[PDB]
């Protein structure tokens, strides 16, 4: 037997991160949950119980602390790529490094129609990920995500014309409501190393804010002829509008609401156009799935 | 043996419900989950295996959506209380009805800065409750409730003065991280029916916004002495503010933030004023609780 | 206003704890989470920010872990009185201490039909739990659980001859599907203090095996008329069985499956006799519960 | 723009069975959760709007409850591969079908000493799962894992000779805890169809049985000197026990329980040699991964 393949690291590292400025008084916060996992020449701690070779996963936690003290946070896109660095740099034998981030929202409170200088709540457990590969000679790739943004729409969804056989019995609609979770991915072009990822730190911010946008305004106005034109609409905007990007990937639910029949109940009309009462079901789901590239 | 007690009924009753205003066009969406459990003269079911005194869980479940159908579901203490007093009217020998509903929220998008006729977002798991109890010849005892509203501030919290003895390790602080998810529920003065109930339709909502409002502000601008004496401000005020509330109750955890002592690397200083890296933790978590009535 | 009521500790301790017997190398592991709260003469943390009368809730931690170094954990009755009474025995001002104890599984390993000195794994989240309320001179409350039990049987349950009414689809059956997760509490009679509770260790497990047995014997061989009547069995069996109980109390979820008509699709016959296949339902879900004392 | 991949389908599926032994009146249920997700010459769904490209997700959610009707759903490798053939044979534009089944576990009751023929409980979170992918002219590639085994070691574990350096503060150690839910999956060669994947039926339920024990095994009995050195030998004896699997893949947390100093308190000895008392962390924990193959 031999190994094929090894990585090791630390998951679920939570860190909280505060910026004062002493001119304004303002403080700012940043939440994240943070893994890392390492690969490298670490084969003889699996074959041979040598542990000369291992980075202890307990240094890993106290270097993204250390990393987070002496470097920016955000864009997570850049602190990603600095901490996937720092190990391919420290370490002869470790040749890359793998670093997500979970960035968790703390968004600042409005009291009485003015921001509120140190006081803030979680609206939403809508995250912002990064996925950041650093590998020894073949440069840094990021893939940037949102998830979690849970949507629904009560009309202006369709879904006819399909396949009809006789495993089928799925009527078809003119009307119905759509909704679900979204899981957006973007894949940047490689980039050659931190020098190159430092000149595009605007752009990171700006994609995401942009991609959230394309998102919920082609959810509202477009009327759907299924999830699947619907998103692919939205990963066809996001390309036009960054060309540093390379691909864009949608992973949605389809979470059903059920008409319910109630004319058993003294001929209660509760379906088609009279329909006001459903049911929502917590499974199963439809799942569907694209990755949009450029020609 | 005897039976001492005895409830029974439907849990995890999912409903959505649609309101489309012709005129306009604009469609609004309601989500809950309701649970009924009803009590009265069944204990023959656990007895004797007499079930004709059990009106079936899945009937339970069909009533709800009838009803749904059938009347407003909002504000959910008046659609609690027609589902509660549904039952005591209908069944000779069910004496007591106990409605939970859980209402979800979904709020209109902002599309390029207009609100939309039919797309929703669910901004945060915040919660608002009712519990509602029906009793015949008693009333109905009505308590709303706001959960999952969760919370941070960077500053302008202290903890000193605590008693000081053998088992105690803890260090004063003059400035630290507070944060907490809020459970906080009003207690209504028992109203005699469901005529009572709909008089006062209007202060359902009006009563949960200030409950709201009064929790954040309140969080946000006061300089902390304890989790306990926070607390007891923003509950004296919702009494104030509202006359016929008897009691509010807050439950709330405090979710702990640590300083990370970096000073065995380099000499890093971050502790007390150079603190800005803290690990947040998931357990154990104080918890503090207090009912506050009328004098 | 005035403060009603007011409780406060720390909440999800989780503790660990090894026996080694040097006789003969066997090793036995304890885990469990902890909740403390105490009330007492503590309003003035609330209204007057006065934290003179706070035993800080990290000491109420520190507390936890010196009491499971010095005191055997098991049974967690015992574990919960020694914790409990420490408070009110320690501080002048604290009244009552309210103490629960979640037990996870830790079962010690068959290696090759032997057991293992050192070695464990969990089956199954089934919980046993105690809720211990110490009350200065009013004693020691201890109420017993087990819960996270889940079973299920795919015959000889019944359910007939229920109320038919405007409201009912349900139709009559002889022959279904019955699963629940068990949660069933036996409440002790009033304990004086800790040389009482003391007096009757050897009570406690012996009385878990046995509420565990019976619920398992009964649920296996009633042929059940409903959730109702099978559970009231097991109640009664309980008490019986223990006359230092004083109530047994069951709470039941009858976690539906549902027949699959398969007819539309070249005749399949899946209903009644011909039921094979079955949706697993996730919500909605009865809930059934009962409370059976002494005559 | 252009889709460069695309795959929908239906997730979340709830499936039950019962078989009915008439001879023996012996009852024997089995409960998946099942996913599928095709692929094909379905992109004009996507990018024209075209939906008679698609077999309804509704339609493969009844696929899924007939194919459960008129085949054995055990082993779960062979349901799998019946399942997604269908697909690829049935519709001629789909020419791949991505299979995920998650086995639950219902383990027959012992009551009195003897199997009960009809009642069954829930031993464990423990899953058995199955990743069945075919593709047209391909074949059928199948990963088969078990997920959930969650165990603990009280001793005879040690980690020291790691790399230490100016981010370490780890303390070597010679004796530890070590805890890990196992998540292990052994890759089969690629077989060339149904007929093949038939004749190695038995195959199946042996090698989920030889991985489930070796694992155990292994984890009592090694004195380990690492995670990583540990899961080697246990992928080592999985890949010599059955020649027709190609690699072993083991994925493992380290759950983390630490020594709790309590000598501040009393001089009272905890650590080391006395450490009796230790404090479970929920996060961050370790997380170990190897890939093994044949030389
Ligand atoms: O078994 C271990 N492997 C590791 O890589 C490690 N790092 N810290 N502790 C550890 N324990
Ligand atoms: O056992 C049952 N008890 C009930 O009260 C009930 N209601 N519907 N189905 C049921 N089954
Ligand atoms: O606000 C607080 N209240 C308390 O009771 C406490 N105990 N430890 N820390 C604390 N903070
Ligand atoms: O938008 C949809 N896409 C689909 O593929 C599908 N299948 N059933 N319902 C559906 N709705
Ligand atoms: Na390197
Ligand atoms: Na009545
Ligand atoms: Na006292
Ligand atoms: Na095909
Ligand atoms: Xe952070
Ligand atoms: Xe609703
Ligand atoms: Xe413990
Ligand atoms: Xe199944």
Same mark, same amino acid.
């Given at each position: 037997?031999?190994?094929?393949?090894?990585?090791?690291?630390?998951?679920?590292? @939570?860190?909280?991160?505060?910026?004062?400025?002493?001119?304004?008084?303002?403080?700012?916060?940043?939440?994240?949950?943070?893994?890392?996992?390492?690969?490298?020449?670490?084969?003889?701690?699996?074959?041979?119980?040598?542990?000369?070779?291992?980075?202890?996963?307990?240094?890993?936690?106290? !270097?993204?602390?250390?990393?987070?003290?002496?470097?920016?946070?955000?864009?997570?896109?850049?602190?990603?790529?600095?901490?996937?660095?720092?190990?391919?740099?420290?370490? %002869?034998?470790?040749?890359?490094?793998?670093?997500?981030?979970?960035?968790?929202?703390?968004? @600042?409170?409005?009291?009485?129609?003015?921001?509120?200088?140190?006081?803030?709540?979680?609206?939403?457990?809508?995250?912002?990920?990064?996925?950041?590969?650093?590998?020894?000679?073949?440069?840094?790739?990021?893939?940037?995500?949102?998830?979690?943004?849970?949507?629904?729409?009560?009309?202006?969804?369709?879904?006819?014309? =399909?396949?009809?056989?006789?495993?089928? !019995?799925?009527?078809?609609?003119?009307? @119905?409501?759509?909704?679900?979770?979204?899981?957006?991915?973007?894949?940047?072009? %490689?980039?050659?190393?931190?020098?190159?990822? @430092?000149?595009?730190?605007?752009?990171?911010?700006?994609?995401?804010?942009?991609?959230?946008?394309?998102?919920?305004?082609? =959810?509202? /106005?477009?009327?759907?002829?299924?999830?699947?034109?619907?998103?692919?609409?939205?990963?066809?905007?996001?390309?036009?509008?960054?060309?540093?990007?390379?691909?864009?990937?949608?992973?949605?639910? %389809?979470?059903?609401?059920?008409?319910?029949?109630?004319?058993?109940?003294?001929?209660?009309?509760?379906?088609?156009? %009279?329909? /006001?009462? =459903?049911?929502?079901?917590?499974?199963?789901?439809?799942?569907?799935?694209?990755?949009?590239?450029?020609?």
């Amino acid at each position: 037997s031999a190994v094929k393949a090894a990585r090791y690291g630390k998951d679920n590292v @939570r860190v909280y991160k505060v910026h004062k400025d002493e001119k304004t008084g303002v403080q700012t916060v940043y939440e994240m949950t943070v893994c890392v996992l390492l690969e490298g020449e670490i084969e003889t701690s699996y074959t041979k119980a040598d542990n000369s070779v291992i980075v202890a996963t307990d240094s890993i936690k106290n !270097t993204i602390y250390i990393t987070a003290k002496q470097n920016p946070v955000t864009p997570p896109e850049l602190f990603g790529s600095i901490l996937g660095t720092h190990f391919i740099e420290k370490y %002869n034998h470790i040749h890359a490094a793998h670093v997500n981030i979970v960035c968790h929202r703390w968004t @600042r409170m409005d009291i009485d129609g003015k921001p509120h200088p140190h006081s803030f709540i979680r609206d939403s457990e809508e995250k912002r990920n990064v996925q950041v590969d650093v590998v020894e000679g073949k440069g840094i790739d990021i893939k940037s995500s949102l998830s979690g943004l849970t949507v629904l729409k009560s009309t202006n969804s369709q879904f006819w014309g =399909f396949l009809r056989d006789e495993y089928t !019995t799925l009527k078809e609609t003119w009307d @119905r409501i759509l909704s679900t979770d979204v899981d957006a991915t973007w894949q940047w072009k %490689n980039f050659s190393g931190l020098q190159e990822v @430092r000149s595009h730190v605007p752009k990171f911010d700006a994609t995401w804010a942009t991609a959230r946008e394309v998102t919920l305004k082609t =959810f509202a /106005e477009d009327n759907s002829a299924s999830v699947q034109a619907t998103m692919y609409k939205m990963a066809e905007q996001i390309l036009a509008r960054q060309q540093l990007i390379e691909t864009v990937e949608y992973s949605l639910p %389809n979470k059903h609401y059920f008409e319910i029949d109630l004319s058993w109940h003294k001929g209660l009309q509760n379906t088609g156009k %009279n329909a /006001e009462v =459903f049911a929502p079901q917590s499974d199963p789901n439809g799942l569907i799935k694209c990755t949009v590239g450029r020609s």
